């Protein structure tokens, strides 16, 4: 059978500090958070209070603890409850037409829970744009403190007739209920494949067989041979033994570290002893250099 | 008013079934699908929701045949690829229409497929 | 976030039943009850757990309090009874109450 044993852990990809985040950025000022060098991390969110909503646009859920991303921004925010819809490809809303804007193109998550339950108070720094004169760029975020301009009249820097300050709040009432709870919501920022791996899928270690002939990889490293303990002593900054040959020959165990040697399997050539044809047609098979098990 | 599915599928476990939620008599764009599995003698359990214009294809993790909605906005079908079929994904799935609103109500829905799996 | 009901209910004809729905923890005060005829597509009784859909009895009612949410039906009829359901929604996973065979004596 097959040994795959690429190493212990190799990291696992932070979105913890994204989704467990005490103090979420507000929706209308989005976190962008690189999550790189690990390994898909799907398995601290079996055990989770329940995101409200779980959509990750690209590619089936199983691939992403299959599947190895680029430049990972896990988006760390807080929306108003009905503004999930808000926050997708082609959405006319409030939060795409103004404070979060995500693109057509985004591969990657939007995903809601309720933080009514932690967020609200009387927490009016949450905030929002109500209006903006465009759609924002793609994972572009808009600023502005800028007047909302509303007539030729300019505003300069005081309120006026129709002069507008563009973000508003959203006050958070300890009552709220399901509509008007606010639902922090994260989403992942990722090309999938044409760049290196940042969120490498959790890679299938094979179960270490030892004292057989098996068909062994090591941390990319391929071989077949016979993985038996060894006492030989490496440096600990090491990967591959050798030997006089180049050729592999002992390694060590990346998961728990350990000296494996490796050897050829039985080989040798088989010998037909017999006499001759004339007399018996019994033969006697050596097999040559083997110890006799494999036989 | 009408979602017509694909009969039953018959697998061995491990195997993979596909099946179509095909929809007529409403506006397939303007509501996404749920996907409603009952299990024979047991209760109403819902895989996924899927959208029209999209992938929005959430999946519940109460058991897993590494499910893809997918819709097929031409003949307006949603599909429910369940593969990785174990026995106990023996049940009759319904699809049922969804608003693609934010708001989550099935009026409407297939007529259920019943997929043995098994050897 | 997981839903309770009564697997079961046996009421009288023209008596009051009520049949509930109980989440665990939080709850969304928006619900729907279904109707499963035995073999046949459960149908949506109770929409935002204050409605019905259209042509459903006047008889088929819900609501919630706390985080129970009802199933209420006053004056059965024979041919009414059913296996009911409730569901959750806004929670992601969608869980479906686990189904309350309803049966009328008489």
């Known amino acids: 059978e097959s040994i795959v044993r690429f190493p212990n852990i190799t990291n696992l990809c932070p979105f913890g500090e994204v989704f467990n985040a005490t103090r979420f950025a507000s929706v209308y000022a989005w976190n962008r958070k690189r999550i790189s060098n690990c390994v898909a991390d799907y398995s601290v969110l079996y055990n989770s209070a329940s995101f409200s909503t779980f959509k990750c646009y690209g590619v089936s859920p199983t691939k992403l603890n299959d599947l190895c991303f680029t430049n990972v921004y896990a988006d760390s925010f807080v929306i108003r409850g009905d503004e999930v819809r808000q926050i997708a490809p082609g959405q006319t809303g409030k939060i795409a037409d103004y404070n979060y804007k995500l693109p057509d193109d985004f591969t990657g998550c939007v995903i809601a829970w309720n933080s009514n339950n932690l967020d609200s108070k009387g927490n009016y720094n949450y905030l929002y744009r109500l209006f903006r004169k465009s759609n924002l760029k793609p994972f572009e975020r808009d600023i502005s403190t800028e007047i909302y301009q509303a007539g030729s009249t300019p505003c300069n820097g005081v309120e006026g007739f129709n002069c507008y300050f563009p973000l508003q709040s959203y006050g958070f009432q300890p009552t709220n209920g399901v509509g008007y709870q606010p639902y922090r919501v994260v989403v992942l920022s990722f090309e999938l494949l044409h760049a290196p791996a940042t969120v490498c899928g959790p890679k299938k270690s094979t179960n270490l067989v030892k004292n057989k002939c098996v068909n062994f990889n090591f941390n990319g490293l391929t071989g077949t041979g016979v993985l038996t303990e060894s006492n030989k002593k490496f440096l600990p900054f090491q990967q591959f033994g050798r030997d006089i040959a180049d050729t592999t020959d002992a390694v060590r165990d990346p998961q728990t570290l350990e000296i494996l040697d490796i050897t050829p399997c039985s080989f040798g050539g088989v010998s037909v002893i017999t006499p001759g044809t004339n007399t018996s047609n019994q033969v006697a098979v050596l097999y040559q250099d083997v110890n006799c098990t494999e036989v | 008013v009408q979602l017509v599915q694909s009969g039953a599928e018959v697998k061995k476990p491990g195997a993979t079934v596909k099946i179509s939620c095909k929809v007529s008599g409403y506006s397939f764009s303007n509501y996404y699908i749920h996907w409603v599995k009952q299990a024979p003698g047991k209760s109403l359990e819902w895989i996924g929701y899927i959208d029209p214009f999209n992938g929005g294809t959430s999946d519940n993790l109460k058991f897993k045949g590494a499910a893809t909605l997918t819709a097929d906005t031409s003949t307006d079908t949603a599909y429910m690829e369940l593969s990785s079929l174990r026995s106990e994904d023996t049940a009759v799935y319904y699809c049922?229409?969804?608003?693609?609103?934010?708001?989550?109500?099935?009026?409407?829905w297939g007529q259920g497929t019943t997929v043995t799996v098994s050897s | 976030i997981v839903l309770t009901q009564s697997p079961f209910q046996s009421v009288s004809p023209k008596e009051k039943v009520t049949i509930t729905c109980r989440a665990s923890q939080s709850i969304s005060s928006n619900l729907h009850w279904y109707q499963q005829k035995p073999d046949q597509s459960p149908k949506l009784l109770i929409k935002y757990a204050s409605q019905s859909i259209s042509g459903i009895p006047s008889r088929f009612s819900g609501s919630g309090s706390g985080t129970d949410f009802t199933l209420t039906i006053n004056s059965l009829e024979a041919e009414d009874f059913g296996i009911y359901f409730c569901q959750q929604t806004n929670f992601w996973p969608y869980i479906f109450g686990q189904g309350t065979k309803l049966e009328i004596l008489k």
């Open positions: 049922a229409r969804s608003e693609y609103d934010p708001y989550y109500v099935m009026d409407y």
